DNA sequence: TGTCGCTAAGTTCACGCAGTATCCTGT
C-alpha cells in the first residue's frame, strides 16, 4: 500500500463505500430522543494534520455532503452535548456540557510491549495477536455478565489494537464517576514501566478475577508456552524469576538448567510454587501480568473523549476499522482486513448495493446485525 | 345578734335626683345590654404574669404617664414650651412634673417636691415653696403644670397652678335611645359580720334584689376578707377557695328569680385571689349554662357600658388612700374625686398606699380612664355619699357591713340621653 | 415585504466582588 495513494482513493471510498445509512442508524438511535444526532460531536483530521472539532450535522444528507466535501483522513466520534457543537460559540459559558456518550475501551498492543517478545512498538504478528483475542473475551464477558450491557460493538483499530463501544442506553447516561468506577473494576494490571510486579492479588480471589483467570487458562499454554516461549532462554525467564520471591529463585534456576521445553519449565515452576501456601496465587499473578488487558482509564473516564470512528481508514496501514464478530473471534485476522486500495480496486472492477460486491460486505453485515439488535431493544422496550 | 335585731331596715340615708316612690322596680334585665366600654385600649380580662418588675420599667411607665398627661394639657392650654424643673429660672417659666413628698411620712406644705419627666428634666427633682400660691390642692403622684421661678436654683416657687382638664363625657349612640331606664343596685364588701362567716348581709341583699328586680347588681369585693378575724387567726375549717365558691354560688343561684345581670369586681382584700393591681377578674368559678349570660367577672378597675351609660367602678378605697396625703390651701371628698377625674387614672397616687400591690405595666395598660364616667362607684370606709363632681355622679354606697352592725347599699336609675341627667335618681339605703 | 424619531425610568436576568455556611478526596 502506498500512502501517497491515500489522497487519490479517499474520495471514492467516501462516495461509494462508507456505509452512511447504517452509520446514521447507529448514531441516531431510532430518533427516540430529539436532537440526539444533531447534538453529536464529530472531529475531522484533514491533509497535513489539520484538526477540526465541534462539527455537527442536521441529518444524513448534511453529513454525507460535508464529508464528501472535506475528504478527511481521520474521523472521530465524540459526545452528545447539551446543544449543537457547531453553535458552541453561541452557547453561554458553562452551558455547553457533554451529556451522553457510549462507554468505550481502547486496548492497544503498544501497552503490552514490556511483556511481548515477538514484536515491538507498532509491529504485530500472528504470535502476539492472541493477546487481543484474550482481551475481547475477558472484557466482553464481564460487560455481558457483571454489568449487564447488552449492545457491544467491537471494532479493529486498524493497526495496534481494538476498541469497544458499549451503547446500551444505560451505558450512555453514565456519569464520569460511574465510568471511572467501571474502568477501575475491570482493571487489574496496574503500574508503569518502573514497576516489576504489577499484579498483587489478595488471599480471596474475587469472582471476576477467577473468571478472567479461567478465560486466560484456555489460551495460556498456546500463547505463552508455545508461541511466545516466555521461558526460551535466561534473558527472558530471568524476568519471571524476578516476579516471584527470591526464596525459591535459586531452586528454580537449577531446574531451568535441566529443562528442554518451556512447557516443562512451566510444569516445574508450578510444582515448585505448590510445594512452597500464601504464594499459591503467584502463578496466577504471572499469568495475569502476561495476559490480562491493560486499560487507559483516561480513555474511558472522560465524556468528551474523541475515539476513532468505525469504518475509518488507517493513515498508515490503510486497513478499514471493521467490526469483529464475537462468535467468529477466533478466526479474526488483522492482516486480512480490507485495505482501502484493495476495495477501490474491487470497486473499479464491475447504487445502494455497491459495497456488497467488495470484501467489505461481511463486516457491514455484522454491523447491520448489531444495529438490528439495537433496534429490537429500542422497540421491545 | 346586733345585726339581726336592727330597726332601721330600709332607711334611705341619702338621696339625689328625681324623687321616686317608696318602692323601686326594675325590668329584671330584660331590655338590658351590659358590656365593657369599648375604647382604644384592650381591657384586662385574664391573668397577667406578675412579681417581676424592673426598676427601669417602673421608671418608664411613670415618665410616660407624666409626659402623656402633660402633652394633653399643653395642647389644651396652648402652652409654648416646658422648662427643665431642676435648672434655675430668674424669670417665670412653665414646668411640668409630678408631686411628691421629700420624706416617707405624709405630705405637708413644707415637704413638697416636684419631679420632672425624662423628656424635659432628665427625671430631676426640685423642692417646692408654696408661699406664693394662693390656692392649691396637691397629692403625691399628681401630674401638674406650674408657672414659677427658681432664683436660687434649689427651690421652685410656683405662682400659678394650672387646673385639671377632665376627659369629655361619652356621646351615646342612638341604638339605645328607645331603651327604658335601668335600675342598678351596687354593694361593696365585706358581706359578713366581723364575728360570723354565714353571709347574713349578703342574704338580705339577695332578698332585696329578688324583691326589687334590678337590671344590674354590681357587687364589689372583698367576698372573703383577708382582715376577717376568723381568716387571720386560722380558725376556718374549709379552704378559702371553698368559702368563696359557696359565696358565689349563693349570689348567682339566689338571683335566678330576679334575672339580674351580676357584675362581680374583685378586691385587694380577697384572700383567695391574686394580690396585684390592676386585679384580673375572678376565674375560679364557672357559672351554670343558665347563668353564663348574666354573670360578668370584670377587672378592678372597670368601665362598664349599660345601654350607653358609662359606669366607672373600683373596689379600691381611693378616697381613704388619697385623703391621707392630699394637702389643700383651705368639700375634701369632692376635691379628691375631681383630682381622680382630672388625672384620668383610677389610681393616680404615687407611691401607693401600704395596702395595695401595684404592677406598673398593668397599671399603665388598664387604669387609664377612657372617658369621664356618667356614674362612678367608689366604695369607701368613709361615710356614704352621692356627689356631683363635674357632671359625674360619684356614689359611695359605704360597705354592706360595718363591723358588727349592718351597713348600706345604693340604688340608682340610669337612662342614656335623659334630659346632662344620665342619672335620674340615686339613693344610699340601709340593709 | 415596510414596519416614524430619540430619551428615560423601570423589571428581570446575567454576571464581578466579597462575606457566611456545608461537603470532598481513599482502599
Ligand atoms: N418623530 C416624532 N417626534 C415626536 C413625536 N411626538 C413628539 N415628538 C417630538 C417632536 C415634536 O416637535 C415635539 C413636541 O411634542 P408635543 O407633545 O409638545 O407636541 P407639539 O409640540 O408638536 O404640539 P402641541 O404641544 O400639541 O402644541 O416632540 C412622534 O410621535 N414622532
Ligand atoms: Zn508479534
From TrEMBL, chain A:
GO molecular function annotation: DNA-directed RNA polymerase activity; metal ion binding
UniProt KW keywords: DNA replication, DNA-directed RNA polymerase, Metal-binding, Nucleotidyltransferase, Primosome, Transcription, Transferase, Zinc
A GO-annotated cellular component: alpha DNA polymerase:primase complex
Cofactor(s), by name: Mn(2+); Mg(2+)
Top EC group: transferase
Annotated residues for binding of Zn(2+): 118-119, 125, 128
Enzyme Commission identifier(s): 2.7.7.-
Origin: domain of life: Eukaryota
Known catalytic reactions: ssDNA + n NTP = ssDNA/pppN(pN)n-1 hybrid + (n-1) diphosphate
GO terms (BP aspect): DNA replication initiation; DNA replication, synthesis of primer
Family of this protein: Belongs to the eukaryotic-type primase small subunit family.
Protein name: DNA primase
From TrEMBL, chain B:
Signal peptide range in chain numbering: none
Domain (DNA polymerase alpha subunit B OB) ranges: 59-164
Keywords noted in UniProt: DNA replication, Nucleus, Phosphoprotein
UniProt subcellular location: Nucleus
Family, similarity comment: Belongs to the DNA polymerase alpha subunit B family.
Chain's role: Accessory subunit of the DNA polymerase alpha complex (also known as the alpha DNA polymerase-primase complex) which plays an essential role in the initiation of DNA synthesis. During the S phase of the cell cycle, the DNA polymerase alpha complex (composed of a catalytic subunit POLA1, an accessory subunit POLA2 and two primase subunits, the catalytic subunit PRIM1 and the regulatory subunit PRIM2) is recruited to DNA at the replicative forks via direct interactions with MCM10 and WDHD1.
Protein name per its UniProtKB record: DNA polymerase alpha subunit B
Name of the gene this protein is made from: pola2.L
Shown chain mapped onto the complete sequence: 159 to 598 of 598
Amino acid at each position: 500500500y502506498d500512502p501517497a495513494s491515500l489522497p487519490d482513493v479517499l474520495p471514492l471510498y467516501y462516495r461509494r463505500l462508507f456505509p452512511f445509512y447504517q452509520y446514521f442508524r447507529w448514531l441516531n438511535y431510532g430518533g427516540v430522543v430529539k436532537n440526539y444526532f444533531q447534538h453529536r460531536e464529530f472531529s475531522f483530521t484533514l491533509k497535513d494534520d489539520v484538526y477540526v472539532r465541534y462539527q455537527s450535522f442536521n441529518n444524513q444528507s448534511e453529513l454525507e455532503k460535508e464529508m464528501q466535501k472535506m475528504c478527511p483522513y481521520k474521523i472521530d466520534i465524540g459526545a452528545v452535548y447539551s446543544h449543537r457543537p457547531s453553535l458552541h460559540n453561541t452557547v453561554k459559558s458553562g452551558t455547553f456540557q457533554a451529556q451522553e456518550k457510549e462507554l468505550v475501551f481502547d486496548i492497544d498492543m503498544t501497552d503490552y510491549d514490556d511483556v511481548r517478545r515477538c514484536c515491538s512498538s507498532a509491529d504485530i504478528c500472528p504470535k502476539c495477536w492472541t493477546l487481543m483475542t484474550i482481551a475481547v473475551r475477558i472484557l466482553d464477558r464481564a460487560l455481558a455478565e457483571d454489568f449487564g450491557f447488552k449492545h457491544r460493538l467491537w471494532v479493529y483499530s486498524g493497526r495496534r489494537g481494538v476498541h469497544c463501544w458499549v451503547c446500551d442506553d444505560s451505558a450512555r447516561k453514565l456519569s464520569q464517576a460511574e465510568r471511572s468506577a467501571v474502568a477501575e473494576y475491570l482493571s487489574v494490571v496496574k503500574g508503569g514501566e518502573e514497576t516489576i510486579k504489577k499484579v498483587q492479588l489478595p488471599e480471596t480471589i474475587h469472582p471476576f478475577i477467577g473468571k478472567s483467570l479461567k478465560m486466560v487458562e484456555r489460551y495460556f499454554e498456546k500463547y505463552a508456552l508455545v508461541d511466545q516461549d516466555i521461558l526460551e532462554n535466561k534473558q527472558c525467564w530471568d524476568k519471571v524469576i524476578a516476579l516471584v520471591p527470591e526464596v525459591a529463585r535459586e531452586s528454580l534456576l537449577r531446574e531451568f538448567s535441566k529443562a528442554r521445553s518451556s512447557v516443562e519449565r512451566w510444569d516445574k515452576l508450578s510444582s515448585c510454587l505448590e510445594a512452597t501456601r500464601r504464594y499459591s496465587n503467584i502463578p496466577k499473578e504471572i499469568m495475569l501480568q502476561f495476559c490480562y488487558p491493560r486499560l487507559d482509564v483516561n480513555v474511558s473516564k472522560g465524556l468528551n473523549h474523541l475515539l476513532k470512528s468505525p469504518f475509518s481508514v488507517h493513515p498508515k496501514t490503510g486497513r478499514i476499522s471493521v467490526p469483529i464478530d464475537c462468535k467468529k473471534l477466533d478466526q479474526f485476522d488483522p492482516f486480512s482486513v480490507p485495505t482501502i486500495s484493495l476495495i477501490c480496486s474491487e470497486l473499479d472492477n464491475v447504487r445502494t448495493r455497491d459495497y456488497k460486491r467488495t470484501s467489505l460486505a461481511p463486516y457491514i453485515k455484522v454491523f447491520e446485525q448489531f444495529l438490528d439488535k439495537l433496534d429490537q431493544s429500542r422497540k421491545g422496550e | 345578734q346586733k345585726y339581726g335585731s336592727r330597726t332601721n331596715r330600709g332607711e334611705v340615708v341619702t338621696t339625689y335626683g328625681e324623687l321616686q316612690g317608696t318602692t323601686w322596680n326594675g325590668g329584671s334585665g330584660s331590655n338590658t345590654n351590659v358590656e365593657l366600654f369599648t375604647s382604644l385600649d384592650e381591657p384586662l380580662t385574664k391573668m397577667y404574669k406578675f412579681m417581676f418588675q424592673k426598676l427601669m420599667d417602673i421608671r418608664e411607665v411613670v415618665s410616660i404617664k407624666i409626659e402623656e398627661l402633660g402633652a394633653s394639657l399643653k395642647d389644651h392650654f396652648q402652652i409654648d414650651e416646658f422648662t427643665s424643673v431642676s435648672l434655675p429660672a430668674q424669670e417665670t417659666v412653665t414646668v411640668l412634673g409630678q408631686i411628691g413628698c421629700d420624706s416617707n411620712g405624709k405630705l405637708n406644705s413644707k415637704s413638697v417636691i416636684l419631679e420632672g419627666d425624662r423628656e424635659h428634666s432628665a427625671g430631676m427633682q426640685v423642692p417646692v415653696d408654696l408661699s406664693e400660691l394662693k390656692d392649691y390642692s396637691l397629692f403625691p403622684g399628681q401630674v401638674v403644670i406650674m408657672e414659677g421661678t427658681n432664683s436660687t436654683g434649689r427651690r421652685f416657687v410656683p405662682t400659678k397652678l394650672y387646673e385639671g382638664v377632665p376627659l369629655p363625657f361619652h356621646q351615646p349612640s342612638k341604638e339605645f335611645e328607645e331603651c327604658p331606664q335601668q335600675m342598678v343596685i351596687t354593694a361593696c364588701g365585706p358581706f359578713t359580720t366581723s364575728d360570723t362567716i354565714t353571709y347574713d348581709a349578703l342574704k338580705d341583699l339577695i332578698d332585696i334584689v329578688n324583691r326589687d328586680r334590678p337590671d344590674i347588681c354590681i357587687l364589689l369585693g372583698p367576698f372573703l376578707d383577708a382582715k376577717h378575724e376568723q381568716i387571720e387567726n386560722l380558725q376556718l375549717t374549709v379552704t378559702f377557695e371553698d368559702v368563696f365558691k359557696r359565696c358565689l354560688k349563693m349570689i348567682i343561684e339566689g338571683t335566678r328569680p330576679s334575672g339580674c345581670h351580676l357584675v362581680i369586681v374583685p378586691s385587694l382584700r380577697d384572700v383567695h385571689h391574686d394580690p396585684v393591681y390592676p386585679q384580673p377578674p375572678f376565674s375560679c368559678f364557672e357559672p351554670a349554662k343558665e347563668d353564663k349570660e348574666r354573670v360578668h367577672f370584670v377587672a378592678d378597675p372597670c368601665t362598664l357600658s349599660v345601654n350607653g351609660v358609662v359606669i366607672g367602678m373600683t373596689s379600691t378605697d381611693l378616697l381613704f388612700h388619697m385623703g391621707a396625703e392630699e394637702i389643700s390651701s383651705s368639700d375634701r371628698f369632692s376635691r379628691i374625686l375631681r383630682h381622680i377625674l382630672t388625672q384620668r387614672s383610677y389610681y393616680p397616687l404615687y407611691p401607693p398606699n401600704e395596702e395595695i400591690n401595684i404592677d406598673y405595666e398593668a397599671l399603665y395598660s388598664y387604669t387609664p380612664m377612657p372617658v369621664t364616667p356618667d356614674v362612678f362607684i367608689v366604695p369607701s370606709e368613709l361615710r356614704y355619699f352621692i356627689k356631683d363632681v363635674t357632671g359625674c355622679i360619684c356614689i359611695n354606697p359605704g360597705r354592706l357591713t360595718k363591723g358588727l352592725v349592718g351597713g348600706t347599699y345604693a340604688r340608682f336609675l340610669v337612662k342614656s340621653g335623659a334630659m346632662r341627667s344620665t342619672c335620674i335618681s340615686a339613693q344610699v339605703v340601709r340593709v
